[PDB]
Amino acid sequence: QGVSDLVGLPNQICLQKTTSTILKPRLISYTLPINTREGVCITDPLLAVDNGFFAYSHLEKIGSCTRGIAKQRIIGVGEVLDRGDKVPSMFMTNVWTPPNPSTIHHCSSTYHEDFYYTLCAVSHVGDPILNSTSWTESLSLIRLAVRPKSDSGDYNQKYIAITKVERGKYDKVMPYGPSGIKQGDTLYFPAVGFLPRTEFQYNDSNCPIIHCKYSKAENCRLSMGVNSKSHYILRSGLLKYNLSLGGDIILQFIEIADNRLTIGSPSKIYNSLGQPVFYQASYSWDTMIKLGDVDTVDPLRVQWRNNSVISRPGQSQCPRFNVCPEVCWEGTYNDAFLIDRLNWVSAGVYLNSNQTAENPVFAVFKDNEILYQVPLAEDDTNAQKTITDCFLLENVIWCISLVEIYDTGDSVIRPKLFAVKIPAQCSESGRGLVPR
Ligand SMILES: *[C@@H]1O[C@H](COC2O[C@@H](C)[C@@H](O)[C@@H](O)[C@@H]2O)[C@@H](O[C@@H]2O[C@H](CO)[C@@H](O)[C@H](O)[C@H]2NC(C)=O)[C@H](O[C@@H]2O[C@@H](C)[C@@H](O)[C@@H](O)[C@@H]2O)[C@H]1NC(C)=O
Ligand SMILES: *[C@@H]1O[C@H](CO)[C@@H](O[C@@H]2O[C@H](CO)[C@@H](O)[C@H](O)[C@H]2NC(C)=O)[C@H](O)[C@H]1NC(C)=O
Ligand SMILES: *[C@@H]1O[C@H](CO)[C@@H](O[C@@H]2O[C@H](CO)[C@@H](O)[C@H](O)[C@H]2NC(C)=O)[C@H](O)[C@H]1NC(C)=O
Ligand SMILES: *[C@@H]1O[C@H](CO)[C@@H](O)[C@H](O)[C@H]1NC(C)=O
């Protein structure tokens, strides 16, 4: 109606620590076909939200989420609407499905002007992250009109295989993360590069092992690949697509700078309150949340927050709150979205457990302080990947969070979509007014 980007001067939000239950998560109303029955897992979820539109993707598998048989991959876009209540809802306007559900891997969506542009890898050897040597570089673009039009040719849906990929020293590159940004007529997608370990230049003396008893200086370089002797190391970055250029589509890989370097992992870049922000999943020993203002997009340098309160579950080598270099490849993607630049306040869903993917908690937090939070499920509810995007509905900050969750009544793993308004008051309605 009035759903737009988080920009300008939003209505006030609570900026102090409180135990009051001011967060009131709601399951959001949607037309996305993301409900099922038992026997199937809905995995590989993607959510993007932009300028009152959204993009969404998943892979439906028969059986296990990791080992099941690929049933259906969908990429869908739509509008974020007002259901009449000044509450957001998601209406899907355009859905694309490939004939082979198993060959599309690692999609990433960026919005521009009429379309969501979704960049995906194409693989016949499974997950390129797990079959790095076998996978031959193959990327495709699925362009979808957010408002389809009849008798428009390829305006509604356009598929294009991309052959010209500028990757510099890397052998191969691919999208890695849910969503990116536009700057003018150029799109940037979160991405990763595969670089042979033999070409990786790293001084082990840069690996911070002070006050870390059990750490060896080699641990940072060894943990830049999926195991200590991996043929490749992984480096996060961006894939640049300039819509203004004529002809044969060219993508260009832009590696992330080496400040607070960790293994290439699903990331996202987004604009909030006038500037790009980056989140990088912590898939190794540096387990505190990695997010910050993007200093420069190309070359890519992120001013990582010194956040001391949000982490992610791992196993015992790199469990939650680990900070010392170890050789490990583990963790979860749980992003956060800047909603107040002056005080650097963010909103996102974290998993409140040290070594188990469970207990999704929606939190509003600063670098060194969680201000307020609310659980999204009963305790010991298993949950893994979370994607949070925030926006304005008539100048009020709302967030939509995708949570990959075990559904009890419908005994399957699937994404659930929560809408959460950020309140203005630090006390909840009626607090202290109901007697005792
Ligand atoms: C969840 O993990 C916390 C681990 O903190 C620690 O960091 C990891 C990387 C390992 O090196 C652990 O060996 C290390 O303890 C743990 O909390 C910490 O607890 C220690 C004492 O046990 C305390 O000195 C730290 O300040 C504290 N840190 C934080 C950020 O809380 C959790 O333990 C729970 O919370 C503690 C405060 C204390 O009540 C513990 O008894 C309690 O179990 C741990 N949670 C669980 C449920 O294991
Ligand atoms: C890496 O690629 C190889 C080659 O495609 C995969 O091996 C195939 O695995 C399927 C599934 O079990 C078998 O049906 C084929 O017979 C295998 N082909 C060959 C040539 O061995 C392997 O599974 C892939 N690894 C991962 C982790 O996806
Ligand atoms: C995207 O491509 C356009 C060209 O199509 C770039 O715009 C040009 O920049 C050069 C400077 O090297 C000028 O000489 C041209 O006149 C510009 N053309 C237009 C139409 O503005 C643009 O800079 C590219 N964007 C990015 C981010 O690389
Ligand atoms: C984080 O701390 C370091 C201190 O070593 C400082 O140089 C850096 O500017 C801090 N980052 C932010 C975003 O404040």
Numbering used by the authors: 176 to 611
The study reports:
The henipaviruses possess an attachment (G) and a fusion (F) glycoprotein which together work in concert to mediate the virus attachment and entry process, but the precise triggering mechanism of paramyxovirus fusion has yet to be defined in detail. The henipavirus G glycoproteins have a type-II transmembrane topology, containing a short N-terminal cytoplasmic tail and a long C-terminal extracellular globular head. Distinct from most other members within the subfamily Paramyxovirinae, the henipavirus attachment glycoprotein does not hemagglutinate and neither binds to sialic acid, nor retains neuraminidase activity, and instead binds cell surface protein receptors. Recently, ephrin-B2 and ephrin-B3 were identified as the functional receptors for both HeV and NiV.
The high-resolution structures described here, including both HeV-G alone (2.2 Å) and in complex with ephrin-B2 (2.7 Å), combined with structure-based mutagenesis, reveal new insights into the molecular mechanisms governing the initial steps of henipavirus entry into host cells and into the paramyxovirus entry mechanism in general. The HeV-G globular head domain (174–602) was expressed using the baculovirus/insect-cell system as described in the Materials and Methods. The structures reported here indicate that the HeV-G head domain dimer is dissociated upon ephrin binding.
